[PDB]
Ligand binder design. Structure first.
Ligand code: HEM
Ligand code: HEM
Ligand SMILES: C[C@H](O)[C@H](O)[C@H]1CNc2nc(N)[nH]c(=O)c2N1
Ligand SMILES: C[C@H](O)[C@H](O)[C@H]1CNc2nc(N)[nH]c(=O)c2N1
Ligand SMILES: CCSCC(=N)NCCC[C@H](N)C(=O)O
Ligand SMILES: CCSCC(=N)NCCC[C@H](N)C(=O)O
Ligand SMILES: [Zn+2]
Lengths: 411, 407
């Protein structure tokens, strides 16, 4: 079968064959679309086909399909699975796998970059202190004094599901949130629950608006342990506006390195439950969502107040007006400090180019429109006008339950 | 089988059961989501009739009554004998209101039960169609205090006798390809404009020429009519702070009236059923004015604002976008033509979703269409999970008539 997608701005029509290689399920059926739903211990028997499918992909990618090296590797993996119930990836296969999980991530707009990914192999790690050291190095390498480089660090894979490595933080670097007795929140409301966990674990909270959380790290299924990332390694950007001199006085800053640490990397049926990865920000993630969501820093009022917009009626578009100024400020600030960031115009345009290249060379590009379209100025970016097809390819990054819900406390 | 939707801003969770009554197909499968794709006999007719009459009779709390069973009997007899059947006025009004209610891409559905239905099933000619349409336009416009309405022409018979309005909306501006290479007016309407000219229209070849109606009665060849100018309410666009905005020469019309869709009620097909509500500001100011393949005005406006257009990261497009949308809303309000902004509209739709969940067990909604094309995440719908599914009665797309019509 062939599936066609049209761009309604350009009339460019693309043809998708890649979706035929898709195995995992979407949530959708012929009777219901769940395209806007946020979230819609293996046997030997299920493992070998997964390994085989993966290794066939790997061996094809290197133009060695059906070679002796290919066949020997299948036999070697087969025998390893039968004898030990699992298997180990060669370094080459790990790097390929991690790049492909990124390539396949349908909610990521930054995928033009997929082939430039520094992979840190942390499969020799044994302890939470070892994890902390690996993560410091990843943060320092990725930060590169503002000239950000994409990286992932891959800790040992799941075995029986009782010895999992986990990073409990949702991102390596995030700000604390503190619920007050009067019901207000100080700092980031998204991180209140994780913050309370850190405090309970013994973190001494400074209790300010932008406190970098400690790492909470679990090795080999043991109880997690707390660590402070050295502050000298946490690059931050104070936010100011090119024309509005009062903007600095809102006291805003953000961190330069977005590093997702709570997802699971699946490669050839193996599960890497601790695999923090980082790239660089698109300006809207900070200036739209982190600053202006009602459930986040929620600064729209204070900003529109200082701009003296008419706030008595929504139809003056004061919220829209303040939103644009905040986003200009974020981009201006990062650029002024030489910290990598991309605007939503540049990012979405590159993604369209990436997407077309992918159709031509690969037979498709799975893409989740709901996530790809930026949360401001949707239709003046080219992605709004682009039909997309969403389906799940492996290797992949997956959600996993938060570890405080599943962890068996050893005490 | 029972499905949950969460709002990620408020943590409110709703349970959808209505989807189990879903009849038509989405385009998606377990392997592939097509959520962002724009367009994804006697034997057939009786189940469809029954299903509809059952829901109608349930809705007036008379399910399984002798009057329910009698009507099912009557319609059955009529199908078996005439191969089709005729809706009672009550069923027609109910079907039309529910087609709107079921419209998953419509953010304005809080209004669904306040719809004026104009029964034009007695219409026989294109002149009759024109009369019906002018009356709809005048009624709905109501000197700027807009009222929702639908006008329903005779249903499909053997399909060689279709009523159709050839226009995509009752009121739209012409588009002209120029020797220059550029496009004058609205590029969305270039082809339909050519069809009008080919059928006889004298185009004034301007930027904002209201198109004529091209009306097809009884499967006949369609005919042209100019809507009396005095019934087409238009709004000049000015900005409350930028005195220069008016020099751009922009206007839009007050009445959004989709005329190219098909209303399906109880298996009956109404191929000509123009309907109208009122505008959400972004439809005009974001899409009609700023789409690259539409009036595409961002460059011009930005120049007037003296913005640095050297680099995308100055957000000059975004700044000008807001201003254009401020001007649209201000101009409609100053002239007292009903308009809703995207904040107020999406807020209402969230309240409507809650009502529908509470009173009906759900609300089919297409997030891709419901979230406004500017400022998405500062409107509450962005944060609201939605389940999309197809209920009947429905509004459906249908092939453009010129691709099908035999002269
Ligand atoms: C290099 C520059 C990159 C840019 C500009 C970028 C951009 C983005 C953005 C804007 C999102 C949505 C974020 C949100 O709304 O929370 C996203 C999601 C995602 N990205 Fe990227 N990204 C980059 C690098 C990477 C890398 C290096 C990886 C992995 C190797 C990756 C994998 C993903 C995944 C798995 C998601 C979905 C996350 C989720 O569902 O929460 N991205 N990306
Ligand atoms: C009363 C005020 C109304 C508002 C504010 C409103 C709002 C909207 C908006 C913003 C859209 C998306 C349009 C687009 O992006 O092109 C839409 C689509 C739609 N509306 Fe409404 N609407 C209203 C009345 C109605 C009425 C009266 C009906 C039927 C009787 C209706 C049925 C539909 C349908 C079927 C669509 C999808 C059309 C398509 O797919 O192109 N709406 N509406
Ligand atoms: C309900 C809805 O799917 C949810 O708010 C999504 C919408 N699109 C998104 N897109 C991105 N990039 N990130 C998000 O967190 C979300 N949230
Ligand atoms: C490809 C994509 O589905 C297309 O651009 C859609 C997106 N959302 C939309 N939403 C509305 N309300 N109207 C539209 O025309 C569109 N276009
Ligand atoms: C880590 C791989 S993807 C890189 C990225 N650009 N986004 C990460 C998500 C960050 C979140 N939206 C925030 O605003 O902090
Ligand atoms: C007619 C029922 S829905 C009413 C509406 N608000 N929009 C209809 C579509 C109009 C189109 N987006 C335009 O910008 O002309
Ligand atoms: Zn779907």
């Amino acid at each position: 079968r062939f599936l066609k997608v049209k761009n309604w701005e350009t009339d460019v029509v693309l043809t998708d064959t890649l979706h035929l290689k898709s195995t995992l399920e979407t949530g959708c059926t012929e009777h219901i679309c769940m395209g806007s739903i946020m979230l819609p211990v293996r046997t030997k028997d299920q493992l070998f086909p997964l390994a085989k499918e993966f290794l066939d992909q790997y061996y094809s990618s290197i133009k060695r399909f059906g070679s002796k090296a290919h066949m020997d590797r299948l036999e070697e993996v087969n025998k390893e699975i039968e004898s030990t119930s699992t298997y180990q990836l060669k370094d080459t296969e790990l790097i390929y796998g991690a790049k492909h999980a990124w390539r396949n991530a349908s909610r990521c707009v930054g995928r033009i970059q997929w082939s430039k990914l520094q992979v840190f192999d942390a499969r020799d790690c044994t302890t939470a202190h070892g994890m902390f050291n690996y993560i410091c190095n990843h943060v320092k390498y990725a930060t590169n004094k503002g000239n950000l480089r994409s990286a992932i660090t891959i800790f040992p894979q799941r075995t029986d599901g009782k010895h999992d490595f986990r990073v409990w933080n949702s991102q390596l670097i995030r700000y604390a949130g503190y619920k007050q007795p009067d019901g207000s929140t100080l700092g980031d409301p998204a991180n209140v629950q994780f913050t309370e966990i850190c405090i309970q674990q013994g973190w001494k909270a400074p209790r300010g608006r932008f406190d970098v959380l400690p790492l909470l790290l679990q090795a080999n299924g043991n109880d997690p342990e707390l660590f402070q990332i050295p502050p000298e390694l946490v690059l931050e950007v104070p936010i100011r506006h090119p024309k509005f001199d009062w903007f600095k006085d809102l006291g805003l800053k953000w961190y330069g390195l977005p590093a997702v640490s709570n997802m699971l990397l699946e490669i050839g049926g193996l599960e890497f439950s601790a695999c923090p990865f980082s790239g660089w920000y698109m300006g809207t993630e900070i200036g739209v969502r982190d600053y202006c969501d009602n459930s986040r820093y929620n600064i729209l009022e204070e900003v529109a107040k200082k701009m003296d917009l008419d706030m008595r009626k929504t139809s003056s578009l004061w919220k829209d007006q303040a939103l644009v100024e905040i986003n200009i400020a974020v981009l201006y600030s990062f650029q002024s400090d030489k910290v990598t960031i991309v605007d939503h115009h540049s990012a979405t345009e590159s993604f369209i180019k990436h997407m077309e290249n992918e159709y031509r060379c690969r037979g498709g590009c799975p893409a989740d429109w709901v996530w790809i379209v930026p949360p401001m100025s949707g239709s003046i970016t080219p992605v709004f006008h682009q039909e997309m097809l969403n389906y799940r390819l492996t290797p992949s990054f997956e959600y996993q339950p938060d570890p405080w819900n599943t962890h068996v406390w050893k005490g």
